[PDB]
């Protein structure tokens, strides 16, 4: 979902 | 530069646009909805074409009538409607099963489709009148389908994703079959034709590309390739320098430039997977002269690439094209009907033919075990799980539910008496053999034999064979614990003279069958893996075939015996005198079931009492040995002393079970159900009481969880005038007892509360209800 | 997604 | 708290 590693 | 008459060159001098107007529509199949997109100028307008759809898969249109055609996967039917949403009517009401793609022949007025489960390519008229299997030879998993009906081309294309995937071209009559693309494909999925340039566009779902190529397979180019935009494309249609495709992986409809694959954009998103797509516009269906307008071909007339006539006459399944090559005659030869789970097939008796097109297949069966047929009227009968018997013609027409069989369970066996027009079947749930009348407009049915305690009753009947002349039933039976042995048994067809023919090493006994000409029974024993013979006298018995795995069906016709082994997954033919010449008809066929041979038998070659004397009995006629007949009446009725008319069962006994209420006669020789059984949903019976004078039966239902399943109900023994008597004020535990005062017309019952109990009275046909006693 | 339409 | 199917 979210733009994180 | 130049373009076809349907287009006009623009100021650019190399771009062409449609003649004008008609506002091209793009129609997309999503599971619940056929979405229409009206391409108004540059924007889109989305709405549903039709309200009543279950799972749409294929789409195409007819430019001359302005109708949209679609296949529904769950209903197993092909429909059509006008583009504006009116006049929805069915095209094919039976015989499709995972029909993958549709193509309308707007010139020849024909309708082509690919089917995945049948592994065939079929053609029919635009009204679906006449149906035949066009190509079945090397077809494994046909999906995409496209046509070029313009005179001079008359070719069809399809894509197959079997073990050696390919795209094939053939004449639209299926003559000049050839393979055009076989080199760089894994999952060919969806086809479309660029009519002005004579190019065919195809896609692949595994290599993820869109390509176009010419009719001969040579000049192929890639539109979209090595591009992560394609996840799982399924259907493709093009219009005015654009391709539109449906992607099942990403669940959206896409647009791109049809030559270099640029200018990619989403047309619409879908909640479900979008499957079929079609562009509705006159440009998509160019006009041409119809070569078969003046043809005298009977049945189908198919366009062809053959130069002189450009047409060929073809005729439906089960017909021969005559030597005139313009007229077709009925193929009255016999064929083997191979019952399977989920479908019944008609295969030719000739082992060299692997077509399976002797009849229109009966798809959508559930728990298929057995089948029967009536050559007159050409009907096929099979039972359905909920307790119904269905019918359909050999040509796929008039598929209807014929009659309800039993309210107590599902029927297993079948056998049709073709001279008295009765059908006999077994219902192993209620453990009875009963009969049902085919003649007339009103259905009548009688339980013939029931399970009393004796060795002669039915235990668990599997198979039925009927001998119209000489009037005997034969059945195979697994027996029961502490009663009926596992046996081959017989009776008069009125159920009078029960007899045991063979008993012994029968454990996993399969269906029985009869060779009427030779008067010998045949049956299969799974526990020993053999097929045995026996005279109807019960004297001579022998083993015919050895080392079978799990025989399921067998039939004897002419000099050969056909059996299907469910575990070997094979259908084999052997001589009826001995195994000898073993021949395989089909192999690698899963879910094999019973067999039957459809053939000509007439009422003239054999006659009995019920055929000589129509209208002798007012309800049911059952023949008996010696040419005589017995009259009989439906469940709930008893035969009058005149021996011909019917009357209500005046004297019987009532037994109540939790599932149902049933009536049995006092005289033990009568195995018929003396009352129409009270069963079905919402039934949980604790007690029953009777009202002999007024002809009612009172019972009390119970339900711990669901309310409104508690109360007292009444019904007549003939099954009419069902009515709730007591519904309000039932205790936590239901009505625990019922008693009727037949003199004063009072009804006594007990309410059972958690810590209290009432005795109550209710005057029948009256709202007066009183409590007599309250105890703790 | 598996190729079979069913 | 009694008999049912």
């Amino acid at each position: 979902x979210x733009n994180x590693x | 530069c130049a373009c076809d008459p349907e287009y006009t060159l623009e100021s650019d001098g190399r771009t062409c646009k449609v003649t004008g107007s008609e506002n091209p529509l793009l129609v997309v199949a999503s599971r619940d909805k056929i979405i229409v997109d009206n391409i108004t100028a540059h924007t889109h307008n989305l709405y549903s074409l039709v309200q009543d759809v279950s799972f749409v898969v294929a789409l195409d249109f007819d430019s001359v009538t302005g109708r949209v055609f679609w296949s529904d996967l769950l209903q197993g039917k092909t429909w059509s409607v006008f583009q504006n949403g009116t006049d929805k009517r069915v095209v094919h009401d039976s015989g499709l099963s995972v029909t993958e793609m549709i193509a309308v022949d707007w010139i020849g007025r024909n309708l082509y489709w690919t089917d995945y489960a049948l592994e065939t390519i079929e053609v029919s008229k635009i009204d679906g009148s006449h149906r035949t299997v066009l190509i079945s030879k090397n077809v494994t998993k046909p999906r995409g389908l496209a046509l070029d009906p313009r005179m001079g081309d008359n070719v069809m294309f399809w894509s197959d994703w079997g073990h050696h995937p390919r795209i094939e071209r053939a004449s639209m009559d299926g003559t000049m079959r050839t393979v055009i693309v076989q080199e760089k494909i894994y999952w060919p999925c969806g086809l479309s034709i660029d009519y002005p340039n004579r190019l065919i566009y195809f896609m692949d779902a595994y290599l993820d590309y869109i390509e176009f190529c010419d009719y001969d397979g040579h000049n192929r180019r890639q539109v979209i390739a090595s591009d992560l935009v394609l996840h799982h494309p399924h259907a493709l249609t093009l219009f005015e320098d654009f391709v539109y495709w449906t992607d099942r992986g990403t669940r959206q409809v896409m647009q791109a430039n049809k030559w270099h694959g640029g200018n990619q954009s989403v047309v619409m998103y879908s909640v479900h997977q979008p499957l079929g797509i079609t562009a509705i516009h006159p440009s998509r269906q160019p006009p041409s002269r119809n070569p078969c307008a003046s043809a005298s071909c009977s049945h189908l007339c198919l366009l062809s690439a053959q130069a002189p006539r450009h047409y060929s006459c073809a005729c439906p399944s089960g017909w021969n094209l005559s030597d005139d090559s313009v007229n077709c005659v009925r193929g009255d030869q016999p064929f083997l009907m191979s019952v399977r789970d989920n479908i019944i097939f008609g295969i030719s008796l000739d082992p060299e033919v692997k077509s399976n097109d002797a009849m229109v297949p009966i798809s959508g069966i559930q728990h298929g075990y057995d089948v029967e047929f009536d050559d007159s009227e050409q009907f096929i009968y099979w039972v359905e799980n909920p307790g119904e018997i269905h019918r359909v013609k050999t040509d796929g027409s008039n598929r209807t539910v014929f009659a309800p069989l039993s309210l107590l369970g599902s029927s297993l066996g079948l056998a049709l008496d073709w001279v008295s027009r009765n059908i006999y079947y077994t219902t192993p749930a209620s453990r009875s053999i009963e009969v049902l009348t085919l003649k007339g407009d009103t259905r009548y049915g009688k339980t013939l034999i029931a399970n009393d305690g004796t060795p002669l009753g039915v235990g668990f009947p599997v198979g039925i064979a009927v001998d119209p002349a000489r009037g005997k039933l034969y059945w195979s039976d697994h027996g029961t614990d502490s009663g009926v042995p596992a046996k081959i048994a017989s009776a008069n067809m009125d159920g009078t003279s029960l007899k045991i023919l063979f008993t012994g090493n029968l454990q996993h006994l399969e269906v029985v069958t009869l060779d009427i000409q030779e008067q010998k029974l045949y049956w299969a024993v799974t526990s020993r893996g053999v097929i045995e013979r026996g005279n109807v006298d019960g004297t001579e018995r022998m083993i015919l075939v050895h080392h079978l795995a799990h025989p399921w069906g067998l039939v004897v016709y002419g000099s050969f015996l056909y059996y299907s082994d469910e575990q070997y997954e094979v259908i084999e033919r052997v001589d009826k005198s001995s195994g000898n010449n073993k021949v395989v008809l089909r192999d690698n066929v899963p879910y094999l079931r019973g067999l039957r041979v459809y053939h000509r038998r007439n009422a003239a070659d054999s006659s009995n009492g019920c055929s000589n004397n129509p209208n002798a009995c007012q309800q049911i006629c059952l023949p008996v040995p010696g040419g005589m007949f017995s009259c009989a009446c439906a469940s709930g009725f008893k035969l009058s002393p005149d021996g011909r008319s019917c009357s209500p069962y005046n004297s019987f006994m009532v037994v109540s079970m939790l599932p149902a209420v049933r009536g049995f006669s006092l005289e033990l020789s009568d195995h018929s159900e003396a009352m129409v059984p009270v069963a079905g949903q919402g039934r949980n019976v604790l007690h029953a009481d009777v009202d002999v004078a007024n002809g009612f039966i009172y019972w009390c239902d119970f339900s711990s969880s669901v309310r409104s399943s508690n109360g007292i109900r009444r019904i007549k023994p003939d099954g009419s005038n069902f009515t709730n008597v007591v519904t309000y004020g039932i205790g936590a535990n239901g009505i625990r007892g019922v008693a009727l005062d037949w003199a004063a017309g009072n009804l006594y019952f007990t309410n059972a509360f958690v810590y209290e109990t009432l005795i109550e009275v209710l005057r029948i046909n009256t709202t007066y209800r009183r409590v007599l006693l309250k105890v703790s | 997604x598996x190729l079979x339409x069913x | 708290x009694e008999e049912x199917x």
């Binding site: 733009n3 590693x5 | 073990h163 050696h164 995937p165 894994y186 090595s226 591009d227 992560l228 935009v229 990619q264 080392h547 795995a549 082994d565 575990q567 070997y568 997954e569 094979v570 084999e572 395989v584 192999d587 690698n588 | - | -």
Partner: protein, 495 residues
């Protein structure tokens, strides 16, 4: 296109056979290293479930449930011999050969059979056991079926001391010397020892690890054995001069870390440079000025450090910084912001004259790459799912890959651009001019490929650093610039 399913190996004839039952079913034969693939059977075969070999006769036996066929063929090829076929063989699923008899299992019949191996025998098979549910395979456990003496194995190498090979010993059909294989790195001149690639390759970060991959899609050898690290490795860049990788780590919710690890034979544990810093989403190395630039996301700062740690300075404040790239020979530094407005910003390496290069049509510009060989800037936006290119001024903006999926790492080398995708868990490549030759470099990885870099054995642009001369006149920290050396002051106070 091929799907090899059941594989068998023959150390005597030194061949590798397998069955394929997908599109275009066949039986293939190959060397022990899979380099001389040839087809034995490709006609009249569908769904070969299993195959077996008798070493003493050199025939390959296989079963077809779709043809109800058991057949055999010689290793050298020729015609298929039908051993057994017909209705009574519905679903053979596995086969083996022992002496003069074949043993196979049947799924439908729930039996394990034994019959003569010679074709044209008509004796009915004997049943070893019956009513076994869900049969799949059958194999022989015998010393006679696995000979070990050199005479019985045709003097097979790799029998003694693994043939002297360090990693893998592959024998070849008629050669007396084994072809040694390398699990990681390249085979030396010695011909039996393995060392680091000593060539150019990719490096990427994965959960707990730094991993390596060759540029050639057809070379599957690892340039170096996987480096193991503590916590998730988020970003990395390579230092030529010391032959080490500078990489960042993420611990807990907020505890970021920066470390380095050497690529020499020592391969010691990664040496930590900082701890207790916030989550870091990118890192770049200045090869000219020998300073490290990195982005702290949880703390909204881009900051610089010396390769030894030592002096540290803030370069800029940024809403949501990710990737950084440096151009020391022209004194400029670029980075990406995916904050409330997404934009790509340029400053001097001192952090002065900050300007936005592209600040339209961007939502999640995760990846940044600069190509010195053509003077173009590349970036990958994960929300738009596009990779784009422009001049360093940001004028000639072009898409190079449409639908890039969820891009994160980007790098460029030779003619291709390499990116990591967090949605498909693959590394793809495409032509840097027009995105034509798009292939996937990796299979679907078991976890998200979090960042990517090249490793280069040749020196990049080697312009003269003005900052070495008297520390470029600055009192503490200095960085190159468009005009002259620019000074910075430490973050330990107000300056």
């Amino acid at each position: 296109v091929d799907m090899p399913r059941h594989i068998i190996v023959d150390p005597k004839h030194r061949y590798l056979f397998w069955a394929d039952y997908g599109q275009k079913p066949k039986i293939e034969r190959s060397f022990l290293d899979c380099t001389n693939r040839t087809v034995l059977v490709s006609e009249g075969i569908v769904t070969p479930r299993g195959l077996a070999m008798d070493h003493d006769t050199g025939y390959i036996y296989w079963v077809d449930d779709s043809l109800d066929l058991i057949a055999r063929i010689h290793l050298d090829g020729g015609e298929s011999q039908v051993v057994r076929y017909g209705s009574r063989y519905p679903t053979p699923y596995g086969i083996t050969v022992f002496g003069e008899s074949i043993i196979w299992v049947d799924r439908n019949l729930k039996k394990v059979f034994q019959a003569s191996k010679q074709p044209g025998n008509t004796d009915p098979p004997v049943v070893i056991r019956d009513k076994i549910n869900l049969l799949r395979d059958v194999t022989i456990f015998d010393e006679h079926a696995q000979p070990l003496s050199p005479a019985e194995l045709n003097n097979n190498p790799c029998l003694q001391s693994n043939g002297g090979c360090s990693h893998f010993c592959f024998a070849l059909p008629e050669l007396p010397t084994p072809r040694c294989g390398c699990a990681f790195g390249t085979l030396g001149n010695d011909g039996k020892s393995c060392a680091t690639s000593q060539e150019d390759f990719l490096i990427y970060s994965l959960n707990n690890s730094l991993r390596s991959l060759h540029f050639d899609p057809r070379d599957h050898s690892l340039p170096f054995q996987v480096i193991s690290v503590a916590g998730t490795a988020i970003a990395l860049d390579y230092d030529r001069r010391n032959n080490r990788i500078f990489f960042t780590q993420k611990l807990n919710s907020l505890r970021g870390q920066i470390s380095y690890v050497s690529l020499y034979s020592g391969s010691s544990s990664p040496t930590v440079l900082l701890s207790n810093i916030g989550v870091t989403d990118g890192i770049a190395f200045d090869w000219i000025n020998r300073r490290i630039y990195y982005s702290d996301f949880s703390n909204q700062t881009i900051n610089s450090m010396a390769e030894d740690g030592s002096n540290r300075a803030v370069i800029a404040r940024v809403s949501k910084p990710r990737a950084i790239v440096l151009d020391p020979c022209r004194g400029y530094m670029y980075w990406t912001d995916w904050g409330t407005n997404a934009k790509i910003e340029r400053a001097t390496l001192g952090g002065n004259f900050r300007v936005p290069i592209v600040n339209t049509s961007l939502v999640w510009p995760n990846g940044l790459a600069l190509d010195l060989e053509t003077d173009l800037l590349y970036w990958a936006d994960a929300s738009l799912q596009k990779i784009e290119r422009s001049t360093l001024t940001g004028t000639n903006r072009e898409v190079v890959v449409s639908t890039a999926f969820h891009s994160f790492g980007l790098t460029v080398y030779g003619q291709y651009i390499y990116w990591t995708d967090l949605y498909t868990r693959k590394i793809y490549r495409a032509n840097k001019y027009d995105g034509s030759d798009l292939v996937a470099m990796t299979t679907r990885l078991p976890t998200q490929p979090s960042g990517i870099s090249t490793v280069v054995k040749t020196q990049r642009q080697q312009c003269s650093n003005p900052c070495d001369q008297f520390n470029g006149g600055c009192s503490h920290i200095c960085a190159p610039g468009p005009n002259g050396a620019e000074c910075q002051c430490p973050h330990e106070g107000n300056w």
